[PDB]
Amino acid sequence: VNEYVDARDTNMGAWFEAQVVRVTRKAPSRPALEEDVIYHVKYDDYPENGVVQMNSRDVRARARTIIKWQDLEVGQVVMLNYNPDNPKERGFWYDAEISRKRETRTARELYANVVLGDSLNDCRIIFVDEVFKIERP
């Protein structure tokens, strides 16, 4: 019945849970711009940052579907958790492309190219059971 979205902070490149407050019309600032729509979003866990003005590219339906480990393939673009400054700890949700997958009786390792804005190639993903499917169209 709702109406739930993810908002991408433009400087970290990560996606955060958010809600849409207003939709306004951005009149072109220059002739080489078209009249586009602005989405006014607020972050669910950061209401101190007030409202942010974003475009449709940085707002999308909220991630709901987890891709099981057995169903992860090399080359898929997914939303996973990663911490660039502490790769062994919990981090933020970035879009990434799975680059390497390995499984043994003991270990389950996954490497992906993490998009942050720049790109990070072959990041060792810790949370291989919390890989989300990106919702489209």
Binding site: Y4, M12, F16, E17, D45, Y46, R62, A63, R64, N81, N83, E89, R90, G91, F92, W93, E130, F132
Partner: peptide, 12 residues
Amino acid sequence: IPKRRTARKQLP
């Protein structure tokens, strides 16, 4: 959807 587990953003 159930809330995701995410770290907290830090200041400079």
